């Protein structure tokens, strides 16, 4: 079945005229947009955002820590990652592949946050205790619907309706710039796009360790904030 009209002759050509002026309309709008961007217009990403766009395996963290020492002198303070987990119906995100990356080299004094689903909760614990980190606390986010209901997440053994994140500690976390018992470890917010995360957790972290460089891992264009050295394949 052809989507277009079978035969209309010039009777369709008149409609063609309509369409073609529509065509010019778009491009002229485009020109305006061009003049709007090539004049010094400021986008949504704020200052002090450092989006390293590179594969985490390809990236050499040694250069990163060298720059850290050269410019600031203190290595990382707060770290996060929400890596692509395993579903069993890329494949190099094997939890072991996530493990062997030397995050322990990237951190000596500060916290960590790792969001993960309950189906990979336990492997997250071994993910965090393996390093000098000690699992101490958890921040959990309860999904919300448009009205204020609870999302009907798929149930394997119970109806999954919340998401979890683990916290760890190595070295000394009382570096002065850290704040304790900042606020509650729960976040109630709507269910945004696929595996998206609440932007208020960055407000939480700003309450936690302000005036210091951060490090989220596996970001998107949404994640970028101020004071956030950030990494991500799609970033």
């Amino acid at each position: 079945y052809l989507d277009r009209l079978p035969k209309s002759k010039k009777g369709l050509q008149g409609l063609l005229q309509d369409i073609e002026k529509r065509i010019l309309h778009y491009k002229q709008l485009f020109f305006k947009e061009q003049n709007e961007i090539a004049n010094g217009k400021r986008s949504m990403v704020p200052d002090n955002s450092i989006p390293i766009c590179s594969d985490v395996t390809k990236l050499n963290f040694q250069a990163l820590i060298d720059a850290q020492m050269r410019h600031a002198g203190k290595m990382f303070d707060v770290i996060m990652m929400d890596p692509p987990w395993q579903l069993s119906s890329y494949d190099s995100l094997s939890d072991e592949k996530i493990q062997n990356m030397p995050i322990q080299s990237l951190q000596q004094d500060g916290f960590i946050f790792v969001w993960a689903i309950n189906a990979k909760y336990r492997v997250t614990i071994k993910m965090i205790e393996n390093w000098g980190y000690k699992l101490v606390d958890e921040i959990t986010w309860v999904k919300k619907t448009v009205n204020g209901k609870i999302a009907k997440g798929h149930g394997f053994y119970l109806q999954h309706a919340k998401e979890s994140c683990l916290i760890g500690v190595k070295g000394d976390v009382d570096n002065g710039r850290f704040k304790k018992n900042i606020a509650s470890d729960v976040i109630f917010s709507e269910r945004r796009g696929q595996s998206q995360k609440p932007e208020e957790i960055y407000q939480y972290i700003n309450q936690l360790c302000p005036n210091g460089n951060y490090l989220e891992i596996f970001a998107r264009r949404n994640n970028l904030h101020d004071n956030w050295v950030s990494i991500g394949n799609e970033l």
Partner: protein
Amino acid sequence: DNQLSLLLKWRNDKIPASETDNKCKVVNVKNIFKSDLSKYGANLQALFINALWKVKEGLNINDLSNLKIPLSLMKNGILFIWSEKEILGQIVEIMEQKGFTYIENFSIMFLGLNKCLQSINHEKSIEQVTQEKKFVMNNLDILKSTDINNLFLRNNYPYFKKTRHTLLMFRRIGDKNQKLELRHQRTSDVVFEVTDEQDPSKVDTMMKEYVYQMIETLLPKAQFIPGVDKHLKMMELFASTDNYRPGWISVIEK
């Protein structure tokens, strides 16, 4: 507004003690993490322990490592254990070396009953933790005009503000060609209720009752009325000194 009516919908279903008979079995030994439990039941399904960790304290974490669970006690079954935030960690790893595999978790989010009564207006007695929850329950749509996140707990904690409690639930498969019967999706992993700030780790009735109802629904076949069988296929530890729930083989530590 808040849609909080649906949040506490199952709490409107209250449904709140069998004597020693073919329906209820009773054990009261001064030791439990040392007493063999396979003699109290075999091939059982539901196995609950009310481990009130607290960092005063009720039970010491390092004690749990000395308890023995044999395959003769249960081939296919589940253990349920409590978790406390000030003692978080050092509990998530003890049980795996006893021979279970992690499957899921359950959790209770406490919505700060004092803040709920404050929003209704605009140390707590047993009455203030039993009837006041009904009081905030029946007028549940008057505070729905407020924000949910406001009324949460603000309890002292080293890293954040402690708000919620947790039920670790662990299933073991031990016998090939044998499985278990489950209802699965009965009660949402998210549930909602208030809890006193004096003992947030502790859970009183109408909430303990909620957990009891959900576990009774998840594992119905584990129960046995006195006529059908005398031996019970599901046992319990650290219950109340006066409650002897039917179906459960209660083991209260005196």
